[model samples]
Target: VETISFSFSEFEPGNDNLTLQGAALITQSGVLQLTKINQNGMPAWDSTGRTLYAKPVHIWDMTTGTVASFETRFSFSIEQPYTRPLPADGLVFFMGPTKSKPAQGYGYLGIFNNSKQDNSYQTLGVEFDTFSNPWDPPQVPHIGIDVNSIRSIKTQPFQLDNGQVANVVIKYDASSKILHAVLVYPSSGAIYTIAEIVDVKQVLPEWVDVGLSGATGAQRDAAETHDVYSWSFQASLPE
Candidate 1:
């Protein structure tokens, strides 16, 4: 087969092939929860964040320098009950080296390294940021294209509110080296899109682990839950 594909309509308890890290878990209802929810009287800080890594996929051939175009679509929801402190941090769809690790939390999106560590991991990602960090755009709840760094080179306003499910589609065209990210709200029919040229081979290795990550800050009052309802991904190299 020249193409690779996989889909998870819902994450069943023991049947999932994904690797869950930190607080990531599959709920009883089969949803992939990437961050902790304020439940069972859990402390606010308990919802720090977590990441879920999927099986590694081949992105390119090192010997031939042949790249593969890929597409990933997922449905996710973010819920913040107490808006007093406001929602924080964000979620990301990242592609990193085969042996990728969950990095720092909060605005780092569980992919980038903390400032204390200057050596950061090289990766490509599309960030659905809810909070405005120093490197983020002025608009809250924005979509940004990240290459190796959390500082997005291209950003667009993406208004995804609490409790609403967002259907996100991210595609990379290897021929043009352009990455396009789109967010749609099924209930409202609202859409947001942003695209930028990113040579993944330059940032990621031939084989990369693609996954979803989310994070929250230390705010005691405000806490959010990041849940993935469904996900699908496909890729193939040019014939």
Candidate 2:
């Protein structure tokens, strides 16, 4: 019938579709906060050992038995308690089956946990990975496309600086069987292609829970906060 479109602005704190788990929340200031500013009286991470699977709505297929193509536009920033030796972990925007948490590990980003060690959930994601873990290493800040695991499919460097607002757009073309992503630096208008063609249905299911996750570990002083300003999602299928 019609395209399924949804939008969220952190300025609007009354979103009922959001299902915030673990440390993720809608702040008093309306930002979708993923990490606590600080825990208790100390500067420790709250959901360090867990993957917070914050889902909004369970997206359904417009045409049953068909995989719907979708496009999402969003912006995020990796803020700091600010550090050098150990910067805070990053974030992942993903689509998965259930609100399932992954096994605790580096770069898992909550949703894309360690699939190697009994991790069983099918997820496709575009990850804004800041911290360099042993699984997929990086020299500068980067973004990647993931299928079932955090080990990137097509990994490449991207311009990512703390406190700078980054705008990203990800789209899935069901007919072409390709998933495309692009990111832009708000202030300078620098654009980067994250992935050209990541085969989708080949790796991910059709209808899934779409959301984001971020983590902090070991980087007590190094840990940072991930916040979302605005986001919009639209799902539809080719006739």
Candidate 3:
């Protein structure tokens, strides 16, 4: 079997393999910041952000059409304003072509545009959504599986706390076409699980980019900062 693997326990200055774009940045403390944040007690407004592994991974053989499976996990947290009001937008672990750009709009999760239904772009993602939009279920905090468009095909209410570190694991099985995810809060040992069936080859290319994206809304009080502490990924393909 052939394999691709990498891990980031924490980010550092001059990390060559990590690509930060739009509002994304590496903080002095080595955390991955996904939005413009106010260091003091103040608050920053809306914005979109993106960060990706600089290299692409092949999910399937272009010649033989044999698909590969992958597993990825990361730890992250969101910091809301002191008010702790409902925050806008959320974050996503996404896969797309190498040219994927950060999409606009807070509801887009910094991964897809409102026009994504037009098929202008292609993306497969698992969303840690905090806000409820027209397309989202009435639940405020939820996990959703999105393919090609922002309208998630499957969703479930999830626990998301401000300033709390949460761990997430996502696994894709090419054989069964099932995508599984688990979210855990280490402090309380609380757990949440969500899954969906998706044939990756149908929505993605042979090789794809993978990473995290997030956004904040235009509402003055709806903004928040997204942070990622660590991440790791591995994929296996038959030789």
Candidate 4:
């Protein structure tokens, strides 16, 4: 019952506890920029441009027999170019095996793509999508859970207005098997939330990697810059 925080305020390239892979860059000002600002700065919707920021450590699990409820929260934002007609693609936070995973749909927040078969869904993720992909349910920004495929398990509209910072919280009940999320935008009363019941054992490996991933296609969705302010993994609510 303690607090473990991963502050993105100032990041050093290589750390034993954290793995910053792909296009993730630590800016001079301390923000964890997942991708750069302009077209040249973004990751290719192809596997080449996607980035992953992961915690090399594992989480609590039933196999060890001491599983406990846990909650994790993070703060981040997406920056869209003013001249663009609309922002494309988005970002994601996921928990899964840290082993090498195939990059399926590069537009799928770097979690999975159409290329992955059912057996490849070895992770769980929350996608903060900003674009209107043809396969997407609605034509707006939304938050959805990824059990395996790019299609969300359960999705709800969310606000990703390019400049505003977003505060996101993901909580799990070890006993109830419930997964809940709360998204708070910088503006007053601007909140989006969703929940579901998922067996962690079925979605993630005992020792897994938790981190951030994102990408953009140059055709319509110009590259966007993402900033992570801070992150925390807690056994209980923060004091």
Please give the ranking of all candidate structures by TM-score, highest first, separated by commas.
3, 1, 2, 4
Residue 97 lDDT (model 2): 73
Sorted by lDDT (best first), the order is 3, 1, 2, 4
Worst 10 residues of 3 by lDDT: 113-122
lDDT of 3 by residue, 53-150 (tens): 99898888878878999999999988766555568888889998896777776898887768345444668889988788888889968888998888
Q: Cα RMSD (Å) between model 2 and the true structure?
A: 3.6
Candidate 1 local accuracy as lDDT?
A: 0.78
For residues 46-69, what per-residue lDDT tens digits would candidate 1 score against the true structure?
Answer: 343444445678888887889999
lDDT of 2 by residue, 119-212 (tens): 2466777888877778766564778888778777777787666588889899887666678899898788788886556555545544567777
lDDT of each: 0.78, 0.66, 0.84, 0.66
> Which candidate has the top score in lDDT?
3
Tens digits of per-residue lDDT, candidate 4, 71-158, equal 7788887777645655557778887667655364346666675735354567788888877776787756788877866777889986
The 10-residue segment of model 1 with minimum total lDDT is 41-50
Pick out the ten consecutive residues of candidate 2 with the lowest summed lDDT.
49-58
The CA lDDT at 127 in model 1 is 86
In model 2, what is the error at residue 2, expressed in angstroms? 6.6
Q: Please identify which of the two predictions, 1 or 4, would achieve the higher lDDT against the true structure.
A: 1
